[PDB]
Amino acid sequence: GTDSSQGIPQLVSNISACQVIAEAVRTTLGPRGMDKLIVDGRGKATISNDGATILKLLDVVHPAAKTLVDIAKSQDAEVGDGTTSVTLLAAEFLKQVKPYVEEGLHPQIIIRAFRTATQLAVNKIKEIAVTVKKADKVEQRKLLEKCAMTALSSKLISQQKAFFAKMVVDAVMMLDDLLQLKMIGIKKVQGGALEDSQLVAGVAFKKTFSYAGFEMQPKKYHNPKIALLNVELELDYQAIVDAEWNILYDKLEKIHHSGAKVVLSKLPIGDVATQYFADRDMFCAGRVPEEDLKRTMMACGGSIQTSVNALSADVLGRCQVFEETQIGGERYNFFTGCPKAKTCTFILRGGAEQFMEETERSLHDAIMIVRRAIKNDSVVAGGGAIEMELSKYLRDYSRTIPGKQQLLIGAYAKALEIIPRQLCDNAGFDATNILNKLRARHAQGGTWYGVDINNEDIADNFEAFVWEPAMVRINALTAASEAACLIVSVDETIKNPRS
Amino acid sequence: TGETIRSQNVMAAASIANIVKSSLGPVGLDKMLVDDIGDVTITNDGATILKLLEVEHPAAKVLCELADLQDKEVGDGTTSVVIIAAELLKNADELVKQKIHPTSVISGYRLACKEAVRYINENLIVNTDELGRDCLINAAKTSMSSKIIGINGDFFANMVVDAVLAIKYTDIRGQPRYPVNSVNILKAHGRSQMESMLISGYALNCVVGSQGMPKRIVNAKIACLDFSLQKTKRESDITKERIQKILATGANVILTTGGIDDMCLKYFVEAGAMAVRRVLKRDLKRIAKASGATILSTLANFEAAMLGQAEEVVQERICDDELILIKNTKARTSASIILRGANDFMCDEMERSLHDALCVVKRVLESKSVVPGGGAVEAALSIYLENYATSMGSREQLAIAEFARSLLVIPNTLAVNAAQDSTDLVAKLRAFHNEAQVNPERKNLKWIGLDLSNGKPRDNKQAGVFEPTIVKVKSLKFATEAAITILRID
Amino acid sequence: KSRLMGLEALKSHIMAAKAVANTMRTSLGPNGLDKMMVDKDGDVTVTNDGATILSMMDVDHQIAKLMVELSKSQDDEIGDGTTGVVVLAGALLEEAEQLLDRGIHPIRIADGYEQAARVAIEHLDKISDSVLVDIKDTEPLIQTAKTTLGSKVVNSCHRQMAEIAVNAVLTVADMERRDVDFELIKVEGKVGGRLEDTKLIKGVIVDKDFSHPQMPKKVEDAKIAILTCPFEVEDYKALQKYEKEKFEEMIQQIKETGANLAICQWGFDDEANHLLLQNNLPAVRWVGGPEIELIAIATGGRIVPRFSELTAEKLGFAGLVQEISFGTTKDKMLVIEQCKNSRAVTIFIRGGNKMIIEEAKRSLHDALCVIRNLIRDNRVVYGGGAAEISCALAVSQEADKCPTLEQYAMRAFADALEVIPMALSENSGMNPIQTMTEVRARQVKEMNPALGIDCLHKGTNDMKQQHVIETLIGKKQQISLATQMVRMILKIDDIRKPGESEE
Ligand SMILES: Nc1ncnc2c1ncn2[C@@H]1O[C@H](COP(=O)(O)OP(=O)(O)O)[C@@H](O)[C@H]1O
């Protein structure tokens, strides 16, 4: 029997709920952090190393955890996935301020101190942010591939990922129209070596029983476009024979009438009658995925047909080239060659089937890091280095403040130390020794020394090419501080239940 | 349920410290100690509290033993050492909980203690020289503050400091030494204390001995005795032959504790001897050690050169009271302070304040090395040790950091018992001491402590709140030793 | 009240994984304990192949689930050694638990296991003394079939099924892609019979009925049709007239197209069948639907369910003339085998029990798959645990030259790879530890790498005479998949089950 509804008890319960929601996702921090399985409730368990996804799929019942996870989601929708460094940071702020609240410090004093410390840190970070945007990035991008391949060093993948980074950066440059992760993806192809994997400027989907109608389509056709169909193409007692015959006749006639090159439908196509479906004289498809559709009308320009024999000029319209090849021994589907093809789907050719998760956790950050480096100019060292620098500034400045805010700003500064600690703990190397050495060498030697994820030692992340834009870090820190102050400001909760 | 017996020891220590925490400082609250048979005891200082508290936990017994041992060294800081040890135990327990082995914690604590005792030795005060005048004055006033006599504080202050300085000895080692019992009290009737003048020698307020003492006699020899010169019925009647023999040996001023002689008047104009009833033993021993004479139980027999000497004797009336001016003897022990007023009862707080001022002056006179009080030194070392720890880089960084953080409990407790929020006082102390090192020009700021009367930061080198260096050094050493002994337990 | 956080969840995962492995560790090897299977309905079957047991086992824990679904991704590439994969995974999990007992972080254990696996891969590459000329290896293939079928009395007629299999794959092996497709199903299970009843028939056999109870089965003509049209006294006279008109037009379509044996999958009138028999052509009613592909592929034709698609080049084809007693008491079927060998050939099996049919077809599938690997890559290593012992020795040697915690992972991986010979010895009813360590000492003192476990209690532990062999790429794939299994399950630290509210 444990209850808490008064002001201070309410605050301590709320920040304990924040503690538990942080513990739920604490260990996933870092490029090579732990991974978690969560069941969806019907048996389709989900596995994902991402931190934001865990919060998205997590059920939250506590109001404090609810508002914290809403702040996290708000952070997610703006810039990448900083939620890992925000939920954890805010929750450990609350954990650090626990005893001061317990001793009777008024929450308004805490909020004022935290806001002052946040303003000081955001103002102080801008004197350290360094821009290398001009220094050989768009032209002579060797620095940009250096930063990209920094992501997965100390691996045998480095030889292949060098070419991988060069080629994906080529794709980004030729599609530098604010690319997202929706228009760019990876498609698993069984077999082959890692070096065999390539890129195609179009969709890539395997043909199944219900997916493709017939082979030997006119691949080298100079103007193939997409056709969308909402009517079935499949095959009083005798009163349905004539209707079925007429339906089949008009379905066969429509393909030649409208002249559609490839027809995409939301219905299965029977490959047991492959020759029967080949009588249309033109290629027809069914069971198209939603992503495949969305990637084909905004690039090629496919039309929509809803009638039995609907005709349009966008079934055989203007698109560059059609591709249909047996990639890896299996014939895939490629709606490439589009006038405004903002599409670069990565052909994942590899032997092991489990390498899909490696690509999920390995290359979507590489495209993410290169896009982040391109979009912004000024960056600071990562791996917790900037957190230690901010902690040093704030801890040293706190002792110059007479008044209650001194202890609180000191607690905020020492709270800022969690990120390097969490990184090195997820790496498996014990946090105390590495963190102490980092603190000493960082308060003395340099302003950018940070944890190394590979050799487990103090590494100059600036010269290691670990770039984090100043604006993204600023926004993440501000959001975390705002969440902490918002939780602190709450002292009473009202429910008003049904019965 | 229960586990990690180390935490149990730490909690026992924390409880023991919390029993005595609130009594720290001159303004501490009292504790009422109840025994099995029901008697009660009221006291302020926690030394007797530990000496009287019924300890039962084996871990707490170690702290009690170490505090008692600390009492045997200098007799102060037992509350402070217990509180510091408890804070160290709590912080070390937390460090253990965060996966730091106690061995590294112990090593860090040892290094922190050594660094603290080295840092303090180069930031203390040895200005208790002949040029230290105002510091002693306002130290006496601070020990005498919050009293109605603050209107005329300076006169009593300079009087008492002159009295204490003029009577100093010089021992075998050459270190000046002061007996508190050397100076005594002397009441007077009539005008108030504002006209009290320091008496250069011991003065007794009793019947007038004789008028035969000149304005200043060339030789005044103290032939003190202990019998009553009374006619009875080397002499059967001890009135004439023994006094004649002692005068032949060269006795100028024969002291008689008991009754006066019947015919002393004729003998006191040719020899000038003393006859006043009820000579106090406390003052008799002091005057004997001053002039150098010894008390003679019997005279029937060494007596010529062994007896003491006095430079001059003055017969005068002070505050409508005749006093005997046996002053300027061989060794400076003979001195008294006249308490002008009406009775000692209405000026009980006045004489008690004078006594405590004399005590706080003699604390700083001996052990010429002195440090500021009022939590100044704790804040200074707390600032020092964090910067010292951040330059190590070993596993002992957190140990020294927590040592520095826990060292602030003494000023915090002092502020708490002073009815001010300890947060503001501690923060202000730390802020003042921060610029004491990061700003070299503001070097004359280390001696900033907390004032218990007003609850605001205040310089204590100028104020006079002072402590012997040995007391704090031993307190820190013993707290570290107790903490290490507790952490070694498992 | 209670919760499962931290490394306790990982310990529970290891417990579940080792429970599953202990379940599967008794059926490994030719002498492995057979395992019946029961369904909720009550179906009873007894199978020794672990792939089926994994596939249809009911597992409740999410760890064991993940195990079985990502273990099912082994049969398609190889089809053999799934039991080996699971046993190795359980051994790795148990050794990982042993390491975690001493405070090692799971990430370090996983990376050490990964390096141990790759090192074992190169070592196993360098140790194998395979033969690369086994293309015209019809005689060694007999030994391969015997080894794949040495668990039962099957060796009595292995002297027949081995050449059955080599002829089957010879009719299937093509030197341009070297694989078996969907339509090449070489399966025909007939319940009841004998070991001799399972013989070599390159024909199409179906369980359908005749046109007439005593119709002449001798239809050598390849003009065989397929009908997708179903059956869809005033009304009786109208129906009779419609039937007559449909018969006349369908016969006219036959004459125009040349598709005589019009087999229909629905009801009809037997009078038309009698009239057609009078016209020297049969017409079978109520035939199977998806049997068009198998019938047409008898000489190379494809499915032609359209009325006019079945032309001369795509007639209902027949395999090769033969007429024997198809069934004594069972309804004999048509002779649909006259003309030419089938690219998608199908063999005839008439084993005397359901389980013998199952084991025969699964063994044939594994044999064709492994030799498909052989023509793809003719690299083999001697099994029986000899490869495992060699890899264990190499890994143990590699254990010293590393200063980090990787040495512990090296040692654990070696002690886990050594489990397979232990399992083989145990399932053979003999002291596992003693026999395995004796073979290990023999291999460390004598450089022979083909010294394994004499599971069949034959002469020597050396498989050179015993001809126990398996493809090298199979061993590499098995080891790599097991290592990826343990690596990816070792990452997982917490499972948050919805619905089960934490009270
Ligand atoms: N290869 C690396 N080496 C060192 N530090 C890294 C590396 N990759 C990421 N980090 C650090 O991990 C921290 C947290 O990253 P995280 O927020 O989990 O990534 P995401 O933004 O994808 O969620 C970042 O501040 C970054 O500095």
Ligand SMILES: Nc1ncnc2c1ncn2[C@@H]1O[C@H](COP(=O)(O)OP(=O)(O)O)[C@@H](O)[C@H]1O
């Ligand atoms: N006049 C004063 N002004 C400020 N602080 C004082 C004063 N006198 C004593 N203290 C404080 O009291 C603390 C302990 O003194 P005390 O209680 O007399 O010793 P103990 O604790 O051994 O009995 C010291 O740390 C000192 O700072």
Ligand SMILES: Nc1ncnc2c1ncn2[C@@H]1O[C@H](COP(=O)(O)OP(=O)(O)O)[C@@H](O)[C@H]1O
């Ligand atoms: N000739 C043989 N003598 C002894 N053991 C053999 C022989 N041939 C194969 N084995 C054993 O069979 C095991 C593999 O069979 P198994 O894994 O049960 O097949 P599946 O992979 O279909 O489950 C190997 O561990 C090997 O030791």
